[PDB]
Design an enzyme around this catalytic site. Structure first.
Site, mmCIF file in Angstrom:
data_model
loop_
_atom_site.group_PDB
_atom_site.id
_atom_site.type_symbol
_atom_site.label_atom_id
_atom_site.label_comp_id
_atom_site.label_asym_id
_atom_site.label_seq_id
_atom_site.Cartn_x
_atom_site.Cartn_y
_atom_site.Cartn_z
ATOM 1 N N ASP A 35 2.016 -0.918 -9.562
ATOM 2 C CA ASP A 35 1.786 -0.168 -8.345
ATOM 3 C C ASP A 35 0.290 0.121 -8.259
ATOM 4 O O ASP A 35 -0.323 0.594 -9.205
ATOM 5 C CB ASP A 35 2.611 1.120 -8.318
ATOM 6 N N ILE A 36 -0.280 -0.189 -7.110
ATOM 7 C CA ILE A 36 -1.682 0.071 -6.863
ATOM 8 C C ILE A 36 -1.913 1.566 -6.647
ATOM 9 O O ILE A 36 -1.188 2.203 -5.849
ATOM 10 C CB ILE A 36 -2.161 -0.711 -5.654
ATOM 11 N N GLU A 78 2.934 -1.166 -1.881
ATOM 12 C CA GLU A 78 1.877 -1.479 -2.846
ATOM 13 C C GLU A 78 2.444 -1.718 -4.253
ATOM 14 O O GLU A 78 1.748 -1.527 -5.247
ATOM 15 C CB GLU A 78 0.828 -0.362 -2.858
#
Length: 159
Positions: A35-36, A78
């Site tokens: 996950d960004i 994301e």
């Protein structure tokens, strides 16, 4: 073609076929959830097209770092998943760390903005009956990683 290589629909189907193949051939099967960090802030400040460049670079990065065959999927806004056939969980962890590091090291946009990600890693266990058993563990390791801030990687343990 990065939105093609990380197609969500294809990912889940490839992941399910890989699970069955893995049990049938008795091969290890690893799963990385990524996950960004602060991706919403990136889109708020730089706009959707630039947010998309980040996603694209990350996809390119998966290829560069993981030379061997693998499946990719963007499973959320994301969040990504990488599935590695015939790959032991430690190897996947090491790959995940390299992706985390090179992403953190890449300067973005005219102002050399640095962006970070977290990753959780697991792999097929004997009692598993669905890809959801694996995803649950990499997803939990991801959120465990996130407890200590941005830019963190964790391998799932039952300990």
């Amino acid at each position: 073609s990065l939105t093609q290589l990380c197609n969500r629909r294809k990912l889940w189907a490839d992941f399910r076929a890989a699970f069955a193949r893995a049990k049938r051939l008795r091969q290890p099967l690893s799963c990385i959830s990524i996950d960004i960090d602060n991706f919403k802030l990136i889109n708020d400040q730089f706009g959707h097209d630039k947010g998309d460049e980040v996603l694209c670079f990350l996809a390119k990065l998966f290829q560069s770092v993981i030379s061997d065959h693998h499946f990719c999927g963007r499973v959320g806004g994301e969040e990504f998943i990488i599935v590695l056939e015939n790959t032991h969980v430690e190897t996947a962890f090491h790959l995940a760390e390299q992706i985390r590091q090179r992403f953190a090291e890449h300067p973005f946009f005219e102002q050399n903005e640095h962006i970070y990600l977290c990753a959780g890693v697991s792999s097929l266990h004997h009692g598993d009956h669905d890809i959801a058993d694996i995803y649950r563990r990499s997803d939990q390791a991801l959120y465990k990683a996130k407890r200590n801030g941005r830019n963190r990687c964790c391998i799932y343990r039952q300990s």
